[PDB]
Paper text:
The heterologous expression of the POD genes from the [name] genome, and subsequent kinetic studies, reveal a peroxidase array consisting of three VPs and six MnPs. The VP1 and MnP4 crystal structures were solved as representative for the two POD families present in the [name] genome. The overall structure of VP1 and MnP4 showed a heme group dividing the protein into a distal largely helical domain (formed by four main helices and two to three small ones) with one structural calcium ion, and a proximal domain composed by another six helices and a non-ordered region stabilized by a second calcium ion. The site where this takes place is conserved and comprises three acidic residues (E36/E40/D175 in VP1 and E36/E40/D181 in MnP4) located near the heme propionate occupying the most internal position with respect to the main access channel.
The resulting inventory revealed the absence of lignin peroxidases (LiPs) and the presence of three versatile peroxidases (VPs) and six manganese peroxidases (MnPs), the crystal structures of two of them (VP1 and MnP4) were solved at 1.0 to 1.1 Å showing significant structural differences. Concerning short MnP, whose crystal structure is now solved for the first time (from [name] MnP4), its main structural difference from P. chrysosporium long MnP concerns the existence of a more exposed Mn oxidation site, due to the absence of the C-terminal extension that in P. chrysosporium MnP (with a total of 357 residues) is partially fixed by a fifth disulfide bridge. The oxidation of lignin-related substrates was not detected in MnP4, where the active tryptophan is substituted by an alanine (left). At this site, the P56 to G59 loop of VP1 presents a six-residue insertion in MnP4 forming a small extra helix that protrudes into the solvent. Also, residues A130 and V131 in this VP1 region adopted a different conformation with respect to V135 and T136 in MnP4. These changes allow the F62 hydrophobic side chain of MnP4 to interact with K137 and, due to this interaction, the hydroxyl group of T136 interacts with one of the waters coordinating the distal calcium ion. Most of them involve the change of small hydrophobic side chains in VP1 for large hydrophilic side chains, such as the substitution of G290 in VP1 by K296 in MnP4. This lysine has interactions with D198 and D200, which are directly involved in the coordination of the proximal calcium. When the MnP4 crystal structure was solved, a striking observation was the high number of solvent-exposed lysines (a total of 20) and other basic residues (up to a total of 34). Another noteworthy characteristic of MnP4 is the high number of surface-exposed lysines (up to a total of 20) and other alkaline residues (up to a total of 35) compared with the other [name] PODs, which would result in a higher net positive charge of the protein and increased stability at acidic pH.
Numbering used by the authors: 2 to 338
The structure:
């Protein structure tokens, strides 16, 4: 099929997505940047999709429709769930764009996450299927993991949704391009790793450092001490890096950084289709841009040593990494306008 600007797709119904791509790249994402709107859009993929619970369905209760646009269509309900603090900003930015292009909310949310992540250095190229229906119901509350939930709780929730522990760790590669706004609002924009525009393994390294700093005036629910000026640390990430159920796979992204993109891609393709049958969607994956940037070598931050790493994988020692020279410079907050 002939799409706009001389582009083609095997299925004519993919053509619309090239026009959505141009709009979000130029406007929402300020010229194809891996910044604030990308980070928010990637988080939104999870907050929409994870509202899916076979455990509830099996007890004769509504379990949620998964990657169905519900968080957007029913934003008034879902964005007031506690675990959805901070999501309404991006939902309200995205909603009129989906409507103006007459594409479904569920499809738009996943598309924005896939396009956006491809803008990050060394980023993924997530599969993109289209055809999700807008006709759904609001998610039940209490289906989105919180940063104060135990590893047992997070793994049981994610397991109900369909993800093994290794896949939970892979999905958390997203925290390599990520910041917080609502855990400590005064430190809004402080990222989870030193490189929030690079889809790299710094998140996995830096979460294994000993927490030594309270970045603001106090700690807050869901937060623990951070290791580096400018960085923010979630309670949950700290625990998952160190728990025996997840610690080896956490370290695996440091030992074998080349695996991060493929494992994230596979887990995201699954997440993006919770509540859907791919065989009844169309494959518009070719619309997603090809990411740029090499696989970076993970390093220890300037001023840190191996003694600062709380190595937690029983079977295998923490890999030998280079250490950045000199003294550490505080990590810049992520810009937002
Ligand atoms: C496994 C349990 C998870 C927990 C407990 C968790 C928790 C959080 C929290 C507390 C924040 C900061 C929210 C705020 O204060 O602004 C956050 C941000 C983020 N999360 Fe996670 N998350 C998890 C899984 C995921 C998954 C599966 C993805 C997507 C694949 C994801 C993508 C992101 C992104 C990209 C951000 C950055 C948002 C921004 O910069 O505005 N998270 N997460
Ligand atoms: Ca949903
Ligand atoms: Ca990073």
């Amino acid at each position: 099929a002939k799409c706009s600007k001389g582009r083609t797709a095997s299925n004519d119904a993919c053509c619309v997505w090239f026009d959505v791509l141009d709009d979000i790249q130029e406007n929402l994402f300020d010229g194809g940047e891996c910044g604030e709107e990308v980070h928010e859009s990637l988080r939104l993929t999870f907050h929409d999709a994870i509202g899916f619970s076979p455990a509830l369905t099996r007890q004769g209760k509504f379990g949620g429709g998964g990657a169905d646009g519900s968080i957007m269509l029913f934003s008034d309900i879902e964005t007031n769930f506690a675990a959805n603090n901070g999501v309404d900003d991006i939902v309200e930015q995205q909603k009129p764009i989906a409507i103006k292009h007459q594409v479904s909310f569920g499809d738009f949310i996943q598309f924005a996450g896939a396009v956006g992540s491809s803008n990050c250095a060394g980023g993924p190229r997530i599969q993109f299927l289209a055809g999700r229906s807008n006709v759904t119901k609001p998610s039940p509350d209490h289906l989105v993991p919180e940063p104060f939930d135990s590893v047992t709780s997070i793994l049981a929730r994610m397991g109900d949704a369909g993800f093994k522990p290794d896949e939970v760790v892979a999905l958390l590669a997203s925290h390599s391009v990520a910041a917080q706004d609502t855990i400590d609002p005064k430190l809004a924009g402080h990222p989870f790793d030193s490189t929030p525009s690079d889809f790299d393994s710094q998140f996995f390294v830096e979460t294994l450092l000993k927490g030594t700093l309270i970045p603001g005036d106090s700690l807050h629910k869901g937060q623990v001490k951070s290791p580096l000026p400018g960085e923010f640390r979630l309670q949950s990430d700290e625990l998952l890096a160190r728990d025996s159920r997840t610690s080896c796979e956490w370290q695996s992204f440091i030992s074998n950084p080349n695996s991060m993109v493929p494992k994230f891609e596979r887990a995201m393709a699954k997440m993006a289709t919770l509540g859907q049958n791919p065989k009844k969607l169309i494959d518009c994956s070719e619309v997603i841009p090809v990411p740029r940037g090499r696989v970076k070598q993970p390093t220890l931050p300037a001023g840190k040593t191996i003694k600062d790493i709380e190595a937690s994988c029983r079977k295998a020692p923490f890999p030998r990494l280079p250490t950045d020279k000199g003294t550490f410079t505080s990590i810049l907050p992520v810009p937002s306008s």
